[model samples]
Target: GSMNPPPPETSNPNKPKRQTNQLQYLLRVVLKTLWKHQFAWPFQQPVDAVKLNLPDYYKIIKTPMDMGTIKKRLENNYYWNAQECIQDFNTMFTNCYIYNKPGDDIVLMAEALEKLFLQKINELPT
Candidate 1:
């Protein structure tokens, strides 16, 4: 016999922190890309394919859960230089599989993004 409603699944403690980090990292990239392409300011232009795809880009990087406080602390406290950020991003993108590759690892992606972002912060002017 089916139970009255299935039992609620237990939440993983590590999952929230991971999701928050991923969201913050994706947001940073979206912001940076906007800055890099000044003409694409506001990042909502119809003619810009890349900017227009920001949502899809975000979806590619996002994870589930609510951990804003943790995410904020992580983003604010960690600092990284420009060169380091670029290198980290390069490493992540290169390592990522193509064609929605099966068994893709999001945790690895999150780690790479975090390193890249911290490196970027260190390189910021003043």
Candidate 2:
């Protein structure tokens, strides 16, 4: 009876669904990369600033005011937009790689973020 046992029957679909567009795949890859590097905390020294929980901070930061108004005031004759600065900061802090190598990962990440922000500022047309 054991030798004659038949293969287990399957009702589930074999083929999985495909992604609708290339952008989805690209986004998936980007998110995966960010997630991989996200956990590698790189801070060496204690931060002096007050740390607010992200969810609460997000709720507090959401405002109805137009960003362009502030941008115009801050930039004066400059060509940079507030949106660009925000994007650059978001990308740096959210995606910067942190690895425990020669230096502390936390410190390295902080330095990387600082450099990225400075670079973003430098790239702006002055």
Candidate 3:
């Protein structure tokens, strides 16, 4: 008796489709890792100006970004590619620098997050 193996499909339409799905999964994984970081808590949600006593936050940042909103946008397919995802993350970090003093803890955290985020994204496919 001869051993047999299954043949590959000649016309696999789902191949490219599956790639996109996997790509999105990779992005989600990157985001999940960031969310787990110790310095990530501050950027997890939209800045609570009222509770945090940041009365001028809105005036300083007109287009604020956060990890939660980025997650939502990703789930909604608002990002056409991974670069857009990186853009939003950068936006979040830039907003931190713009709103906080250079020596502020949040600024330091944002810098740390930026370093880690870039490293993770560099591991992904170009």
Candidate 4:
């Protein structure tokens, strides 16, 4: 009863291409929702160390990630799959956690946004 079967491959080449386009569209939709969230403002743009007077930010978070950059990457087709996209989102959250205190407002916003991302992805077609 626990046996699992492999997924079938379609003979129509166009089917695969269509599926890829569909996924990108769905991902953008999810992104739009995240951008609209009340807690999204902080994570919208990359952190500005000098402007924010955080001279040590770059030292602490080497690989900075943000929703704006992610959106640009998506538009440019930098991601090959959903995994790559999700990883960027995860990185953004991790960067916030590493730089800000555990209970800080920014950290809390990241937590909520991450939770919302997970929930939205679940609604997409697998």
Candidates 3 and 4, the one with greater lDDT: 3
lDDT of 1 by residue, 8-92 (tens): 1223334333324443553465335433542322212211224444334333433211123222333543323334333434433
Per-residue lDDT over 1-126 for candidate 4, one digit per residue giving the tens place of the 0 to 100 score:
122122122133332222365357545687899999999988888776666777777777767888887876666556657676787889999989999899998888889999998888787665
Cα deviation of 78, candidate 1, in Å: 21
Q: In model 4, where is the ten-residue run with the lowest total lDDT?
A: 1-10
| Candidate 2 C-alpha lDDT tens digits along 30-116 | 223332444423321111123422233223332211123223322332213344334533533433222123466655665554554
Better of 2 and 4 by lDDT: 4
Compare the candidates by lDDT and give the number of the best one: 3
Q: What is the RMSD of candidate 1?
A: 13.2
Q: Which candidate number has the best TM-score?
A: 4
Which residue pairs collide in model 4, if any?
A: none
The TM-score that candidate 2 achieves is 0.23
Question: After superposing candidate 4, which stretches have Cα over 4 Å from the reference?
Answer: 1-22
TM-score of 3: 0.78
lDDT of 3 by residue, 1-126 (tens): 222122212233333322355347545677889999999999988887777766778777877788887876666556556666777889899999998899898898999999988787777755
- The Cα local distance difference test for each model comes to 0.36, 0.33, 0.74, 0.73
* Cand. 4 Cα-lDDT: 0.73
Where does model 1 exceed 4 Å of error?
A: 1-30, 33-104
Query: Which of the two candidates, 2 or 4, achieves a greater TM-score against the reference?
Result: 4
- List the candidate 3 regions with Cα displacement exceeding 4 Å: 1-26
